[PDB]
Amino acid sequence: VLSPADKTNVKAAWGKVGAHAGEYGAEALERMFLSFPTTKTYFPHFDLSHGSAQVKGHGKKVADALTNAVAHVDDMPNALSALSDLHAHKLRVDPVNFKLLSHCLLVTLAAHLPAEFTPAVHASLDKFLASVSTVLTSKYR
Amino acid sequence: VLSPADKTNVKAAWGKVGAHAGEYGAEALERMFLSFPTTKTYFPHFDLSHGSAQVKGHGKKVADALTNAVAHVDDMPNALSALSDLHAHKLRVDPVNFKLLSHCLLVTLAAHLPAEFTPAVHASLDKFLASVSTVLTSKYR
Amino acid sequence: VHLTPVEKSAVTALWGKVNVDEVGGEALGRLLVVYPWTQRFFESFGDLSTPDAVMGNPKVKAHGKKVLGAFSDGLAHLDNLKGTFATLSELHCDKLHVDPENFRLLGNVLVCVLAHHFGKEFTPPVQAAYQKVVAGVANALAHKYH
Amino acid sequence: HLTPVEKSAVTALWGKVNVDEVGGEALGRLLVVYPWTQRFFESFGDLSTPDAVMGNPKVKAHGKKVLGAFSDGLAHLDNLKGTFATLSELHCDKLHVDPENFRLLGNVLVCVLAHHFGKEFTPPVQAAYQKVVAGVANALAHKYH
Numbered sequence: 001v002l003s004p005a006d007k008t009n010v011k012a013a014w015g016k017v018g019a020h021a022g023e024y025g026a027e028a029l030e031r032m033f034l035s036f037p038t039t040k041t042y043f044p045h046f047d048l049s050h051g052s053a054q055v056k057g058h059g060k061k062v063a064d065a066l067t068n069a070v071a072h073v074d075d076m077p078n079a080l081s082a083l084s085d086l087h088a089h090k091l092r093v094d095p096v097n098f099k100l101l102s103h104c105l106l107v108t109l110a111a112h113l114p115a116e117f118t119p120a121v122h123a124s125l126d127k128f129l130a131s132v133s134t135v136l137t138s139k140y141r
Numbered sequence: 142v143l144s145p146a147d148k149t150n151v152k153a154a155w156g157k158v159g160a161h162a163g164e165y166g167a168e169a170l171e172r173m174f175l176s177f178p179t180t181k182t183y184f185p186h187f188d189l190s191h192g193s194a195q196v197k198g199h200g201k202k203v204a205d206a207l208t209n210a211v212a213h214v215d216d217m218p219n220a221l222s223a224l225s226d227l228h229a230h231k232l233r234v235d236p237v238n239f240k241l242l243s244h245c246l247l248v249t250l251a252a253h254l255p256a257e258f259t260p261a262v263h264a265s266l267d268k269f270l271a272s273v274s275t276v277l278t279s280k281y282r
Numbered sequence: 283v284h285l286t287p288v289e290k291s292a293v294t295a296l297w298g299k300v301n302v303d304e305v306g307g308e309a310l311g312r313l314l315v316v317y318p319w320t321q322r323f324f325e326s327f328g329d330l331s332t333p334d335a336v337m338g339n340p341k342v343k344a345h346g347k348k349v350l351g352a353f354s355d356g357l358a359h360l361d362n363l364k365g366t367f368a369t370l371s372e373l374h375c376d377k378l379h380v381d382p383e384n385f386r387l388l389g390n391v392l393v394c395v396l397a398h399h400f401g402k403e404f405t406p407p408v409q410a411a412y413q414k415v416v417a418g419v420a421n422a423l424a425h426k427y428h
Numbered sequence: 429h430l431t432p433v434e435k436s437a438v439t440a441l442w443g444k445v446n447v448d449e450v451g452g453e454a455l456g457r458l459l460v461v462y463p464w465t466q467r468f469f470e471s472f473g474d475l476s477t478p479d480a481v482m483g484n485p486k487v488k489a490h491g492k493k494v495l496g497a498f499s500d501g502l503a504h505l506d507n508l509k510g511t512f513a514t515l516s517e518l519h520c521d522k523l524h525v526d527p528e529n530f531r532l533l534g535n536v537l538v539c540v541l542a543h544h545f546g547k548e549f550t551p552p553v554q555a556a557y558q559k560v561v562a563g564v565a566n567a568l569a570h571k572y573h
């Protein structure tokens with residue numbers, strides 16, 4: 001459950017991501033695929049090689065969904081119902097994999113926005129990504 | 142993220158608890174303390190002896206606190222604010238302990254309400270207790 | 283895991299009453315219903331689309347008997363769960379890549395199923411003993427991860 | 429465990445870590461991001477705000493001991509269960525720290541490493557470090573096995 005401070009930390013940090021959201025999404029993927037190879041079984045049809053165009057494009061889609069979640073942080077289950085259907089009903093992703101991706105996203109953000117990634121903001125982003133993960137892995141339809 | 146039907150199941154199931162609120166909460170407690178002894182470290186000021194009048198009484202408020210949560214299911218952050226303060230802010234209960242009490246509540250329900258403890262209801266109650274758990278273990282205030 | 287003698291006796295007497303043709307299938311069915319991502323490991327089981335589908339699914343029932351039998355072997359080999367599950371540890375860990383939290387989930391679903399079947403006879407001391415067992419079994423299943 | 433190239437990239441990087449800061453930042457971040465872990469440090473003092481935690485000298489002091497413990501596992505990458513057997517007994521038998529928290533701290537340390545080294549903390553480097561922290565988490569949980 002996000003506090004008031006949490007929600008303004010996330011929106012301001014995500015602001016600072018700017019036009020690099022897609023870059024950061026793709027790097028988080030790559031990091032997750034290299035650090036946690038089991039996660040690759042969810043994309044058997046992806047070219048996963050280093051610098052894969054398919055990974056860069058997917059990264060942009062994840063960034064864009066996260067951006068939408070930031071915009072709708074107070075009504076995530078309505079805003080994310082399409083994605084919840086995809087990940088919870090169809091793919092049936094194990095929630096451990098969301099923790100892995102969320103971790104790799106925090107690593108990516110820490111590496112690129114060191115000034116933003118204070119301890120308070122780290123905490124807020126962790127809770128944000130855990131909230132997103134809960135929506136996407138819950139069948140509430 | 143609780144669905145429509147999950148909310149109906151929880152109300153139907155937990156409603157069938159009734160006057161046994163205190164009894165089931167006490168036994169779930171007893172089950173946690175016996176099966177997972179570390180959980181007792183949060184009750185050093187408690188006589189945990191089998192049949193303790195403290196445990197017995199403690200378990201009644203949890204059933205009632207649960208009942209209150211079932212009563213404000215769609216607004217648990219506000220409705221449980223004070224219990225959040227205690228578990229998250231004051232006590233700093235590690236979230237694993239909530240998974241243990243949750244599991245013991247489910248065990249207690251299955252043992253005392255076999256006809257109602259369908260798989261669907263089982264899943265709904267698991268989610269609801271997970272919902273109550275995250276609200277109680279996070280700082281949003 | 284170390285069960286006191288009283289716990290072993292209690293555990294063994296309740297287990298002897300278990301319906302070996304259904305409890306395993308109820309435990310697996312509930313795992314697939316309560317934690318839907320586990321269905322991902324059983325696509326070749328056919329209809330898993332509804333709780334009614336899953337519970338009545340013949341392949342989930344048949345496979346539940348095997349799992350139950352695995353727990354039965356463990357109960358007679360408490361002192362060496364590790365070796366007992368040597369074979370299976372490799373299967374789920376190396377070949378199958380099941381996240382070991384799912385081992386804990388199934389054990390706890392089984393405890394729920396035993397409470398479902400036995401009611402007041404599934405007392406807190408009896409649960410405490412079974413929780414030691416299923417943690418013993420889950421640990422040993424996860425040993426090729428240690 | 430670590431391929432030759434993996435082994436060499438991790439030890440190059442570890443050489444540059446600031447041993448007087450990183451330890452304290454990872455524990456502080458653990459206590460900030462996962463606040464229930466504060467329950468294990470009631471003797472450490474003020475933990476009431478993020479800035480309070482990261483300023484705590486007992487937090488910083490304590491964080492250096494973990495960093496050195498990690499540096500031990502690196503020097504004994506093949507024999508970790510034993511390197512931490514004492515640590516394991518302390519955390520498991522005496523403190524009863526739920527071992528999920530071991531994984532949490534290792535992933536915070538990885539964040540801290542990313543925070544300090546920027547682009548130098550490449551995905552291949554992180555992948556090697558994730559193997560390390562998992563091994564430390566697993567060796568530290570050995571008494572639970």
Ligand code: HEM
Nearest residue numbers: 039042043061062065066083086087091093097098101132
């Ligand atoms: C922050 C967490 C996540 C977000 C915001 C997210 C978002 C998205 C989005 C926007 C799509 C595009 C769906 C479409 O093309 O219409 C997608 C697809 C997909 N996602 Fe996720 N995802 C997340 C986590 C995960 C994780 C952890 C996994 C597995 C480890 C996963 C597996 C997939 C798969 C397999 C697809 C389908 C890919 C395809 O067929 O193109 N997602 N996701």
Ligand code: HEM
Nearest residue numbers: 180183184202203206207224228232234238239242273274
């Ligand atoms: C569904 C889960 C839970 C619910 C609904 C719940 C609800 C409550 C309620 C209503 C109270 C007392 C409120 C009052 O004083 O009026 C309470 C107190 C307390 N809870 Fe929980 N609780 C839950 C889980 C836990 C867990 C898992 C732990 C620790 C293992 C815990 C530890 C405590 C303690 C230590 C107290 C105060 C005891 C005292 O007054 O000395 N709670 N809880």
Ligand code: HEM
Nearest residue numbers: 320323324348349352353374380384385386388389420423
């Ligand atoms: C926790 C205790 C568990 C026990 C005692 C257990 C036991 C078994 C046993 C005895 C088999 C039969 C293998 C054979 O006959 O050679 C089996 C197969 C299998 N297990 Fe488990 N298992 C457990 C947990 C899990 C979990 C949690 C999952 C997935 C979420 C899983 C997935 C599978 C799969 C996919 C198979 C093979 C299915 C097939 O035939 O295609 N196991 N398990």
Ligand code: HEM
Nearest residue numbers: 465468469471493494497498519525529530531533534568
């Ligand atoms: C995950 C890797 C970890 C490592 C490598 C590690 C390492 C250490 C070391 C070296 C010490 C000092 C040993 C001594 O003073 O004799 C220590 C003590 C301690 N550890 Fe950890 N630790 C880890 C995780 C954790 C976690 C997650 C917690 C709690 C959430 C924790 C709680 C404690 C406490 C409470 C102490 C003693 C504190 C006091 O002086 O009051 N440890 N640990």
